[PDB]
Design a protein around this ligand. Structure first.
Ligand SMILES: *P(=O)(O)OCC(C)(C)[C@@H](O)C(=O)NCCC(=O)NCCS
Length: 85
């Protein structure tokens, strides 16, 4: 069958690609294990990343999830479980 590590891992990559797009960066040089604050997410860029995830998927996620999950690799697990992955 498929070589995939898990269903949620595809969404963890895609959330890191969305974050690199908001931060005007390459996903090849973004660290997905690093915090949003250390990656340089300002207040407006946090709201724009949350809005980009709400546009990408019908998950309806609120900006309070940035405090519950401090990295994109943690945050994407909620975006995956709300899609049933
Ligand atoms: P960022 O993630 O540091 O967020 C900053 C903020 C959007 C919360 C902040 O700039 C803000 O607007 N806080 C609310 C301030 C308020 O309600 N009243 C004081 C107006 S001077």
């Amino acid at each position: 069958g498929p070589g995939s590590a898990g269903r949620q891992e595809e969404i963890a990559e895609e959330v890191a690609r969305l974050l690199a797009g908001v931060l005007y960066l390459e996903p090849d040089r973004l660290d997905p294990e690093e915090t949003f604050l250390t990656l340089g997410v300002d207040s407006i860029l946090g709201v724009e990343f949350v809005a980009a995830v709400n546009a990408a998927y019908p998950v309806g996620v609120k900006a309070t999830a940035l405090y519950d999950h401090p990295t994109p690799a943690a945050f994407a697990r909620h975006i995956a479980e709300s899609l049933g992955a």
